[PDB]
Amino acid sequence: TAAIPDEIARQIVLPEGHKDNVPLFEAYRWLRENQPLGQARVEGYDPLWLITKYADLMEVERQPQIFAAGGGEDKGSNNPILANQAGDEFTRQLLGGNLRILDALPYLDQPEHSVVKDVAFDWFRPANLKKWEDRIRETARASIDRLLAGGPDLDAVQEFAVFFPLRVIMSLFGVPEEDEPRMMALTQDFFGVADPDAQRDDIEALSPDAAAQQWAATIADFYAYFDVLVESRRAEPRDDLATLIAVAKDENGEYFPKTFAYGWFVAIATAGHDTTASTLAGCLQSLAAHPEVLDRVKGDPDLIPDLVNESLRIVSPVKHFTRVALQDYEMRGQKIKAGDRLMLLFQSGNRDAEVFDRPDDFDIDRRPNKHIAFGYGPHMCIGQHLAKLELKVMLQELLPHLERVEVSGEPKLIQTNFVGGLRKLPVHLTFS
Numbered sequence: 373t374a375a376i377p378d379e380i381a382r383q384i385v386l387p388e389g390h391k392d393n394v395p396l397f398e399a400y401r402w403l404r405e406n407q408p409l410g411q412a413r414v415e416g417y418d419p420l421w422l423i424t425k426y427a428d429l430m431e432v433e434r435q436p437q438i439f440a441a442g443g444g445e446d447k448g449s450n451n452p453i454l455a456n457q458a459g460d461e462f463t464r465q466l467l468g469g470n471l472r473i474l475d476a477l478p479y480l481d482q483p484e485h486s487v488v489k490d491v492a493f494d495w496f497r498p499a500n501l502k503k504w505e506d507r508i509r510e511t512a513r514a515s516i517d518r519l520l521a522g523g524p525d526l527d528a529v530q531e532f533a534v535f536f537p538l539r540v541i542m543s544l545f546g547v548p549e550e551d552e553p554r555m556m557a558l559t560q561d562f563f564g565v566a567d568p569d570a571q572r573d574d575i576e577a578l579s580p581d582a583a584a585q586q587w588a589a590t591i592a593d594f595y596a597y598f599d600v601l602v603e604s605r606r607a608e609p610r611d612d613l614a615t616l617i618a619v620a621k622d623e624n625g626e627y628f629p630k631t632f633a634y635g636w637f638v639a640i641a642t643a644g645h646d647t648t649a650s651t652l653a654g655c656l657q658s659l660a661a662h663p664e665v666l667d668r669v670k671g672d673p674d675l676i677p678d679l680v681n682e683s684l685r686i687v688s689p690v691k692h693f694t695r696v697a698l699q700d701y702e703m704r705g706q707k708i709k710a711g712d713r714l715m716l717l718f719q720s721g722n723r724d725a726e727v728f729d730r731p732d733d734f735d736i737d738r739r740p741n742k743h744i745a746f747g748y749g750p751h752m753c754i755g756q757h758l759a760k761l762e763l764k765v766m767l768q769e770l771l772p773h774l775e776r777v778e779v780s781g782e783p784k785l786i787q788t789n790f791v792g793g794l795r796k797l798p799v800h801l802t803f804s
């Protein structure tokens with residue numbers, strides 16, 4: 373019944389707690405072993421049930437009519453992405469009483485979620501992504517050509533891994549190549565709201581609501597860009613993902629509101645490349661630590677999907693979404709009350725020893741690899757098949773050209789409790 377101890381709670385709830393993976397993962401582990409379902413009561417935050425166990429993540433996510441993302445019929449009464457209390461008060465002042473700052477899938481509950489998700493569900497299915505594999509492979513090869521040209525010493529993140537997923541999604545999306553640097557800068561603002569090296573110049577960095585001001589400012593910049601793209605594609609449809617979303621109409625034959633397209637576009641333009649870049653950089657970091665794995669996958673390229681799955685489980689770059697209980701609910705001997713918020717800790721589920729043998733080991737021979745890096749339930753990642761295709765294609769093209777990865781300098785993580793991973797990985801590569 374006791375609250376989670378304050379230093380364990382702060383490690384997971386505060387963005388500064390994610391600056392270093394070692395103490396973060398040790399806090400997840402302490403909970404899984406000692407207090408698998410407790411309430412964090414951190415100053416400045418709402419109370420949060422920390423969902424640390426793999427089984428519990430599935431139990432919550434498969435019951436959306438009990439555990440809502442956006443607050444159910446009171447739309448926007450829950451923020452699916454954890455802000456501090458001051459930040460949710462800023463957003464309620466800006467929007468007028470609610471937190472639904474985007475019409476993107478994470479903010480929506482059924483049945484609205486289901487109607488909106490169906491606009492793009494088919495596009496993202498594996499069979500419908502096959503048509504893009506040759507373009508993806510040509511982009512991977514061009515990126516590898518630049519890696520070989522630039523020599524063996526680099527930041528494997530900012531000087532390699534960020535570019536391939538950005539070019540892939542912008543080409544599929546239909547954003548011109550010259551607009552990639554703007555999308556990259558806005559993505560850093562969006563995922564960097566609480567990172568001290570990613571502060572926008574136009575917000576008060578030290579305000580109690582700074583992250584929420586940065587979130588809102590970045591969304592307004594994306595809206596200005598995507599208004600022009602939606603109007604362009606409605607006027608002249610093209611064979612791109614922008615068009616599919618921009619022209620979408622509801623059951624009454626009316627366009628979905630423009631902000632619904634903007635919501636898809638914000639998710640595509642941010643998660644559509646950043647998570648893949650994080651997983652690729654993480655995989656390279658793990659191949660430096662486990663050179664015998666690089667040797668094995670070069671010897672058997674059919675192991676590449678297994679390498680991708682284990683990189684997803686270990687990196688788990690999307691750390692959480694929040695839920696709110698619409699009714700009282702008993703789980704694991706605890707009484708969640710109506711109105712209580714939950715924090716779904718996907719990285720912790722991915723280290724659950726009840727599911728994974730030696731869960732901190734990098735082991736590509738987990739078959740099946742039961743990871744929950746893409747979440748679960750109706751909100752399960754829509755982009756998962758595109759991410760796994762891009763990572764497979766890039767590793768098929770890259771690994772034959774790598775004999776060894778050495779980390780030659782200090783890795784840096786994005787300081788976030790949301791969408792994180794490496795921002796810097798200094799390497800020395802040995803090419804074949």
Ligand code: HEM
Pocket residue numbers: 433477478479489541639640643644645647648651684688689690693718744745746747748749750751752753754755756758759
């Ligand atoms: C390594 C790559 C990725 C990882 C690990 C990842 C992980 C996740 C996770 C954990 C969730 C939340 C699921 C839940 O609420 O249960 C999610 C949601 C989502 N992801 Fe992915 N993602 C990846 C790539 C992508 C890509 C490539 C796209 C788009 C092209 C994308 C678009 C989305 C969207 C739109 C949502 C919201 C779904 C909803 O609420 O219904 N993701 N992702």
